Amino acid sequence: PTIAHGDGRRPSKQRTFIVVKNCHKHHISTEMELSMLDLEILHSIPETP
Amino acid sequence: MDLKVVVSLSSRLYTDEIAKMQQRIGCILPLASTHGTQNVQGLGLGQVYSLETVPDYVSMYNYLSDCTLAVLDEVSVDSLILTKIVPGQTYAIKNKYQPFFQWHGTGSLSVMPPVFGREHATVKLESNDVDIVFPMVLPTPIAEEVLQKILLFNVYSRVVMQAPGNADMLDVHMHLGSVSYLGHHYELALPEVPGPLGLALLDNLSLYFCIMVTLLPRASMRLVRGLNLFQEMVPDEIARIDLDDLSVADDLSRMRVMMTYLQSLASLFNLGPRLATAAYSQETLTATCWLR
Amino acid sequence: RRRLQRRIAGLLPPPARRLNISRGSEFTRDVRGLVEEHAQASSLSAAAVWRAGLLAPGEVAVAWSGWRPPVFGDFLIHASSFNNAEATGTPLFQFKQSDPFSGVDAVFTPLSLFILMNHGLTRMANLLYDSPATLADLVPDFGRLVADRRFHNFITPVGPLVENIKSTYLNKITTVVHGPVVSKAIPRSTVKVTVPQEAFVDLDAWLSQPCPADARLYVALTYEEAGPRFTFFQSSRGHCQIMNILRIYYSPSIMHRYAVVQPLHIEELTFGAVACLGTFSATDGWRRSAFNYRGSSLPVVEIDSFYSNVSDWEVIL
């Protein structure tokens, strides 16, 4: 909006502002070991206690 | 009362043609007809300012004063919706001309035919084989000074290509290479090699002007012998008592061709379609003007 | 083909020019619709705008008559350079400033122009402007710009003032550059161009067949021996006549300028220039009056009903 000025000035008209806001992506990744022996144990079925 | 002259294109444009046209979305151009749809061959100064013939200022000025003019409004991909100027109403034009002469409020604008090179005022369309030549629109005192300075440059280039003992090529260029108006000190693009045997712009006007001022002194002598003493004190008397005997057929022929070359030239130095501005706001480079 | 009917019924009707009146005491709806003309002003309400029709395109029509709205050219001036007691209708003369990017303007009424030229008419000039020096530097080199006789192509007449808000430091005036001079106030009242009587001369009175529809006001700078003068001609002829007619009228002063000084130079050779200022009714115009200041008065020429239309400057010789 604008104020009507009585004095001598160049009158500013209807002003309308267009502004854009972009997003930021963020990537995150950690690494975790797992052994092959307990993976084979997972693939195996146990019999003895 | 509507004014949309929508000129349609046969084959639609590319992207870069629109990229050139959107930077000339406020200039004016002459039409051929005042009808609601047209084709592209009637647009601004293609048929008279072509690149294949020798162009002259005279027929370009005659065609520019001849037909209606039109500011352009929208450039679609295959249509150029524009509006023509009638003397009833007032319009909004923009100074998007490549020799950028800064306008002013309540100034008077002259729609001139292009002098500063075809490539400065063109939109080279390829999809259709047309060259939309936009006419030069620039304020009237600058129009007067640039006409004087292109004309004297033409005459002075022609006399130094006539004989190198006449003048120096820097001396003609360090005066007529600049136009000055309200401190805006511009520099003019001058074709330093126009080429002999005409074949260039501003030869036919310069030829007209030089034949006119060649035929001028015996014309003044004849028109003071036809009729007083005040008129015979301002010029020198060597232009007064020069001949007093020429053959009447050649005298009448010279006087008649001097009169035609004067009336065409004097109609020409009035810049034809003249526009008068009201409030030129160069925050948006917009001038508000009407047809005067 | 019927949508076109409803559209062309709206684009059809020209204004009904003739009308069969029956009795003048009737004052029926048809003659009221003939005499009604819409205003350029209403109060800011929905009913008032929607009845006055202010939002109509091109003209003002409640929902092409030979009538067009005017165009205003607003100038911002140093408030000392324009005496704010001057009336509405005075022809202003904006000087094209030699400063490259100056957003301030230097307009002149002819009274303020008179003290620029010389440095009752002179009494009202020095009472309206006590200071002949703050205008002598608006034009930066007046002696050079007149001594080379290129003063006529620098002054652009911008027609009469119509509304002037009196601000304190930097003054804003609204002129009319082209078209019909009329006021924009909440009571609308007539604006009449006032030119000083000693400066204004006539041209049918100086010459002493047909009657034209309008007469044209002319302004005329001329370079004399004792400085330039701004005479104001009124004529009812055409321009191409008026150039020869004023050449006849100045043919005394042309010989006087060639006689009292001999122009050894070449830029001195012009003898003034004339520019048209617009048309007015040739029948009942220029009824004289006097412009009353706080202490004195000058006689003034009050041209009513102006159509402001500026032309360019054409030399006289």
H helix or E strand, kind and range, residue B59: helix B57-66
Contact C170 A8 (CB under 8 A): yes
Q: Which of B1, B234, B290 sits opposite C178 (nearest CB)?
A: B290
Alpha carbons B112 and B30: distance in angstroms, whole number: 11
**CB C308, CB C178: distance < 8 Å:** yes
| DSSP annotation of C200 | B
Q: Across the interface, do B276 and C68 touch by the CB < 8 Å criterion?
A: no
* Residue C44 neighbours by CB under 8 Å, 6+ apart: none
Residues 6 or more apart from B235 whose CB is under 8 A from it?
B220
The DSSP line for C54-115 is TT-SSS------S----EEEEEEEETTSS-TTS-S--EEEEE--S-TT---B----HHHHHH
The whole-angstrom separation of Cα C225 and Cα B261 is: 36
Question: Cβ–Cβ of C310/B276 closer than 8 Å?
Answer: yes
Residues with Cβ < 8 Å from A14, sequence gap 6 or more?
A2
Cα B14–Cα B19–Cα B24 angle in degrees, nearest 5: 125
- Report residue C169: phi and psi, to 5°: -95, -55
- Cβ within 8 Å of residue C156, ≥6 positions away: B106, B107, B108, C93, C94, C95, C96, C310
Q: Are C95 and C82 in contact (CB under 8 A)?
A: no
Tell me if chain C has a CB within 8 Å of the CB of A1.
Answer: no
C:121-150 residues touching chain B, CB 8 A cutoff: none
C76 vs A6: CB contact, 8 Å cut-off?
Answer: no
Closest Cβ opposite residue C158 in set B88, B106, B230: B106
CB contact at 8 A, C41 and C184: yes
Distances (CA, A) of B286 to B25, B194, C175, C277: 12, 36, 19, 26
Phi-psi region of B120 (alpha: psi -120 to 50; beta: other; left: phi over 0): alpha
Does B101 contact chain C (CB < 8 Å)? no
For the beta carbon of residue C181, count every other beta carbon within 10 angstroms.
Answer: 26
Compute the nearest-CA separation of C290 from chain B (Å). Answer: 31
**Tokens, residue B122:** 């063109």
Dump the DSSP string for B152-179.
HHHHHHHHHHH-TTS--HHHHHHHHTEE
C165 and A7: CB-CB below 8 Å?
Answer: yes
Going through chain A in order, the beta strands assigned E by DSSP cover none
Question: In angstroms, what is the resolution?
Answer: 4.1
Residue B87 touches chain C, beta carbons under 8 Å: no
Task: Answer whether B2 touches C (CB < 8 Å).
Answer: no
**Residue contacts between B and C (CB atoms, under 8 Å):** 48
